[PDB]
Design a protein that fits this description.
Three copies of one chain form a homotrimer.
Chain A lengths: L1 H5 L1 H19 L7 H7 L1 H28 L2 H32 L5 H12 L4 H4 L2 E3 L6 E3 L3 H16 L6 H16 L1 H20 L3 H24 L4 H7 L1 H10 L2 H13 L6 H14 L2 H17 L3 H12 L8 H13 L6 H33 L1 H7 L1
Antiparallel strand pairs in A: 1-2
Bound molecules: ligand 6Z6 (3 copies), barium ion (6 copies) and rubidium ion (RB) (3 copies).
One rubidium ion binds next to helix 19 of chain B.
Keywords (chains A, B, C): Amino-acid transport, Cell membrane, Chloride, Disease variant, Glycoprotein, Membrane, Metal-binding, Phosphoprotein, Potassium, Sodium, Symport, Transmembrane, Transmembrane helix, Transport
Membrane topology (chains A, B, C): Multi-pass membrane protein
GO molecular function (chains A, B, C): glutamate binding; glutamate:sodium symporter activity; high-affinity L-glutamate transmembrane transporter activity; L-glutamate transmembrane transporter activity; metal ion binding; neutral L-amino acid transmembrane transporter activity
Chain lengths: 391, 391, 391
C-alpha cells in the first residue's frame, strides 16, 4: 500500500499503457473515417501542445544559465566529457547496427550538410523559435529550429558568464524563468496519464521490424548501463527506475524535445541530479544524440541493399539527417529519402515502413532519452570536482 | 468653459463622431473605386495598428502581474466572482435574445469545440503572439491567439506568485512593462480623435437590423447598470461617464482587444479602479465575454428559421464561435457559417447581413466593453476584503 | 612588424579582398551550374546569417537604452542635431546626382508612401521582428521591419526614461543585452576574413556604371570629411581609419543593418566614441540614411530619360523606396520599379542594371556606413555639453 501512495503517477502512467492497449484493441474494428480517429486521439493531442509549448522557454533558459553558472574554462572541459560520451555511444550503436544485419540479414545529399550548417547560425532568433531552414526548389519551413536556439543560447549564456557584474541580472532572469517553466511542468505531468492512454490507443487504430527492436533493447538496457557501471561504479537500473515517469512519456510522445521538460523533472527529483549539469547535458542530448536513431537508421539503410565498401559514407549521411530533424514534422519519413540517394536505391520501400514506424519511432526515443539521462549521470561523476570549485 | 478644459479629449472624440458622420455624408456620392476608399480611411487605419501593437505586451504583462500580486488562494476565489458575473450576464443576454424574436418576429460543428481546446494550450508561445489554430482541409492561421496567451500568462503569472523570492524579479519586470505599455497608450489616445473621424467616415461609404439595436441598448444601458446597483449600491451612469473615452473608441474599433489598452486607461484614471483587479477582470473579459455577441448572434440565428426545440444546442455553438474568434480577421463573417450547419439552414442569408454588420459590430462591442468595465466594478466591491489583506 | 601585431584583423580583411578577387578570377571560367556557385559562396553565406541574427537584439536594445540614458528634454534637441545632418547630406547627394548627369549625360506610387506609414506603426511587435508590410493584389512579407522596431524602441525607451525608479530595471536589462550581443559580435568578427573572401569571389562569378562610382567616391571621401572638418575641426581620415574593419565588411555585406553590429564595434573601440550617442545615431542612420542610395538612384532615374521640370517629384519617391526597404530581399531591384511609374518610363532597362548592380550596391553602402559613422562624430562634438550634464 505504501508503494501506491508514493509512486501514484508512476503507476498511473503504467496503467495508461495497459488501458491504452486494451481500449485500442477493444475499438480495433474501425468503421470510422481517419477524420474521426483524429477526434478520438484528442485528449492526448492536447498533452503534446502543452509539452511543445514548454520546449522553447526551457531549452533557451537551460543553456543560458547552464553555461553562465559553470566557470568559463571549466565549461569547455566539461563539454569534452559530454562529447566523449556522445561520440563513443554513437560509434557502438552504428557498429551494433551492422552486426544485426550480418548474422540475421532479413533536396540533395550535399544540401543536408549545408542546411545543417545554415541552421547552426540562425538568420533571425524570433523566426528560429518556430521555423527551421531546409532549401527547396519559402525555404524556412515550420517547426522550431532547436539546433539554432541551443547554439545561440550556448554562446549567449557564456557571454553572460564572462560579463559577471552586468551579466548577473540576465542569468537571475533565465533561472527564474527556468524555475517557472518547471513549475508549469509539474502540472502537465498530471494530464500525462489521461493523455498517454488516448495517444497510443489512437496510433494503433490505423521479421525486419523485429530486427531493430532486438538490437535496440540490448544497446539500451545492456550496453548503456554497462557504460554507467564502468564510469560511475553505481547501480544503473536504480537510476533508470528514477527516470520511469520520463521513459513511459518517451514511449508515447516519440520526441526527445517534447519529453525533455519531463526528463528534466524526473532526473532532478527522483534521481537527485544537479541542475547545472542537467541544464548542460540534457538539452544538447535531446537534440544531437544519435545512439537511438543511428541504430534504427543502420538497419533501415542496409534492408534495401538486400533487394539490390562505402559503409563509412552511409553512417555520416544518416547523422546529418537526424540532427537536421530537431522539431520537423514527419521527421523519419523525409530524412530516409536522402540516405537512399547516397546509396542509389529506390524510395518504393518507404511506403511500407511508414505503416510500422509509428511504434518503432517510440522505441528509438526511449533509448535516446535513456542515453541523455545516463549521459548526465556519467558526466556528473566525471566532473564532481568542477562543481565543488563553484560552491 | 471649465468642462472644455478638463474633458478636452472626451469632447474631441464626441466631435470626431459628429464630424465623422458629416464628412462621410458629405462624401457619400462615391465615383471612387474601393481601392481609393481604403486610401481615405488611412488616418484611422494607423490608429488600429498602434492599438493592436499594444494588445500583446499589455495582455501578457496584465495577467502575469495580476495573478502574482493577488494571493495564491484568494486568486482562485476572486476568479469564481468573475465567472459568477461572466455566466449570469451571458444567460440573461441569450434569454433576452429569444424574447426579442418571440414578440417582434421579423470546418465542422465539432471542430469549433476542438479548435477552441487546441488554442487554450498553445503549441508554441512565439507563434501564439500572432497565429491562432483552426483546422482546414497550414491550419495555424494569421491573427494573435489571445486565448492561448491569456491562459499561459495566468498559470505562468501564478507560478511566479508561488515562487516568491526567485519570482519577485520577473513580476517586477512585467509590472515595469505594463507601466511602460500604458505610458505609450496615453499618447495613442491623442491620435484617436483624428483616427475615429477618418475610420467611421470610410466605413459608411461602401427591420431585422433594428431588432438587435433595440435589445442591445436595453441590455447594455438597463440590465447591466441594474446589476451594478444591485451589488455595489453605487451610481452606474457616473461609472459609465468615466469610461466614455473607452466607449467612443469601442464604437469605431469594434474589437474589445484593440480597445482594451484604452479601456484600461479610462478605468484606472477617470473611475479610479485598482490596477490588480483591472489586470485580472479586463483582459479575460475582453476575450471570453459573451454578453454583447450572444445577444447579436441569438437574433442572427433565429432570423433564417422564419424563412424555413433544440434551442440549447444553438446557444452553446454560438459561444464556441466568438471565444474561437479572439483576433481573427472577418470574425462575425466566418463564425456565423458554423452555427447554420448545426441548425441546418443555407448560407445564402449571410451575403445580405455583411452589408449592415459593419455598424452592428460596433454596437455589440460597446455593450461588451461596458460589460467588462462594470464587471470590474462589481468584482472590486465583492472582493474589497481580499485586497485589504495584501496591504 | 608592430603594425601586423596590432592591426591583425584589419590586414586579414584587406587580404580577404585581395585573395577574394584572385580566387574569383582564378575560378572565372564557369562550367558549373548556378546551384554549385551558391554551394561555393557558402563560407560567406554563414557570416551573413550570424550578422543578421545580431541585428534585432542590437537595434532594439540600442535605442531602448539610448533614449533612456539621454535626458528627456535633451533627447529631443540631440535628435534635431541628427536630422540636421540627415537632411543636409541628403540634399547635397541628390544635388550632386543631377550635376553628374548634366555634364556627362551617358504596387503604386501612392502605395509606397502609405506602406511606409503602415510600417512606422507596427500592428504586432513579434511579427515586426521578421515581417514587413507592402500591400499586393498576404501583404505582410518576409524580412524584418527595422523601421517599426526602431520607432517602437524609441518611444518605449523614452517611456522608461520618464519612468525613472520602476523603469531602471528594464534599462539595466537592455544594457546587459546590448553588452552581451556586442560580446557575440567580437567573435563573428574573426569569421569575417574567411567570409568576405568566399562572399565577393562568388558574386563576381555570375560608362553609365562608372558615372555612379565617380560621384559616389567624391561625395564619400571629399564632401562628407569636409562636413566633419567644418563642425568638429578634427582630422577625418584618422576617424575613417578607425572604422576600416567596418568599411571593408560594408563593401561585401551591402547592408547597413547587417554591418551595424561591426560598425558599432569599430566606432566604440578604434575611434573611441561614447556608447550613448552610437546607440542613438547609428541604428537610425543605418535605416533612414539616404546619402549613399539617393546618389545611386538619382543617376538610375535620369538614365532612362535620355532614351525618351518635375525633378522634385522624382527625389521624394526615391526616398520613400529606400526607407521602405529596411531588410527586404532584392531591395534595389523592386524599389526601382515604382520610381519608373512616377516618371512614366519602361521597366525594360532594369534587366540590364541587375547584371552590374551587385558591385554598385556594395559601393552605395560603403558611403552610407561612412555617413552614419561621420554622422555620430559630428553629433558628439555638437552635443558634448548634453553628455556632461548626465555625468
Ligand atoms: C553541436 O552540439 C553540441 C553543442 C554543445 C556541446 C557541449 C555541451 C553539451 N552537452 C554543452 N552543454 O556545452 C558545451 C559543449 C561544448 O562542446 C563546448 C562548450 C563551450 C565552452 C566554452 C566556451 C564556449 C563558447 C561557445 C560555445 C560553446 C562553448 C559548451 C556538445 C555538442
Ligand atoms: C477561460 O476563461 C477564463 C480564464 C480565467 C478566469 C478567471 C479570471 C478572470 N476574469 C482571472 N483573471 O483569473 C482566474 C480566473 C479563474 O477562474 C481561476 C483563477 C486561478 C486561481 C488559482 C490558480 C490558477 C491556476 C491556473 C489558472 C487559473 C487559476 C485565475 C475566468 C475565465
Ligand atoms: C524617422 O527616423 C528618425 C527617427 C529618429 C530620429 C532622431 C534620432 C536619430 N538619429 C534618435 N536616436 O532619436 C530621436 C530622434 C528624433 O528626431 C526625436 C527624439 C525624441 C525625443 C523626445 C521624445 C521622443 C518620443 C518619441 C520619439 C522620439 C523622441 C528621438 C531621426 C529620424
Ligand atoms: Ba550519443
Ligand atoms: Ba559569478
Ligand atoms: Ba459575460
Ligand atoms: Ba509576495
Ligand atoms: Ba543622411
Ligand atoms: Ba535616471
Ligand atoms: Rb521521433
Ligand atoms: Rb468585432
Ligand atoms: Rb543593399
Amino acid at each position: 500500500k505504501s508503494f501506491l501512495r508514493r509512486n501514484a503517477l508512476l503507476l498511473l502512467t503504467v496503467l495508461a499503457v495497459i488501458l491504452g492497449v486494451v481500449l485500442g484493441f477493444l475499438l480495433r474494428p474501425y468503421p470510422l473515417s481517419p477524420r474521426e480517429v483524429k477526434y478520438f486521439a484528442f485528449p492526448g493531442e492536447l498533452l503534446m501542445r502543452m509539452l511543445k509549448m514548454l520546449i522553447l522557454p526551457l531549452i533557451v533558459s537551460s543553456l543560458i544559465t547552464g553555461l553562465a553558472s559553470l566557470d568559463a574554462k571549466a565549461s569547455g572541459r566539461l563539454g569534452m566529457r559530454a562529447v566523449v560520451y556522445y561520440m563513443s555511444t554513437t560509434i557502438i550503436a552504428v557498429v551494433l547496427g551492422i552486426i544485426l544485419v550480418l548474422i540475421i540479414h532479413p533536396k540533395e545529399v550535399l544540401d543536408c550538410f549545408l542546411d545543417l550548417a545554415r541552421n547552426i547560425f540562425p538568420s533571425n532568433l524570433v523566426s528560429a523559435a518556430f521555423r527551421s531552414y531546409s532549401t527547396t526548389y519559402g525555404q524556412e519551413v515550420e517547426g522550431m529550429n532547436i539546433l539554432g536556439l541551443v547554439v545561440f543560447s550556448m554562446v549567449f549564456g557564456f557571454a553572460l558568464g564572462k560579463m559577471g557584474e552586468q551579466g548577473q541580472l540576465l542569468v537571475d532572469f533565465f533561472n527564474s524563468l527556468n524555475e517557472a517553466t518547471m513549475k508549469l511542468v509539474a502540472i502537465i505531468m498530471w494530464y500525462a496519464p489521461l493523455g498517454i492512454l488516448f495517444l497510443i490507443a489512437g496510433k494503433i487504430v490505423e521479421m525486419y521490424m523485429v530486427t531493430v527492436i532486438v538490437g535496440l533493447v540490448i544497446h539500451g538496457l545492456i550496453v548503456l548501463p554497462l557504460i554507467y557501471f564502468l564510469i560511475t561504479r553505481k547501480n544503473p537500473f536504480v537510476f533508470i527506475a528514477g527516470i520511469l515517469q520520463a521513459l513511459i512519456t518517451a514511449l508515447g510522445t516519440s520526441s526527445s524535445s517534447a519529453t525533455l521538460p519531463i526528463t528534466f523533472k524526473c532526473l532532478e527529483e527522483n534521481n537527485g541530479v544537479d541542475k547545472r549539469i542537467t541544464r548542460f547535458v540534457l538539452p544538447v542530448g535531446a537534440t544531437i544524440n544519435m545512439d537511438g536513431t543511428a541504430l534504427y537508421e543502420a538497419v533501415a539503410a542496409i534492408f534495401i541493399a538486400q533487394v539490390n565498401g562505402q559503409i563509412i559514407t552511409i553512417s555520416i549521411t544518416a547523422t546529418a539527417a537526424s540532427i537536421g530533424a530537431a522539431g520537423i514534422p514527419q521527421a523519419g519519413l523525409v530524412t530516409m529519402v536522402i540516405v537512399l540517394t547516397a546509396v542509389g536505391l529506390p524510395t518504393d520501400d518507404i511506403t511500407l515502413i511508414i505503416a510500422v514506424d509509428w511504434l518503432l519511432d517510440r522505441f528509438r526515443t526511449m533509448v535516446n532519452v535513456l542515453g541523455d539521462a545516463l549521459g548526465a549521470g556519467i558526466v556528473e561523476h566525471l566532473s564532481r570536482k568542477e562543481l565543488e570549485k563553484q560552491d
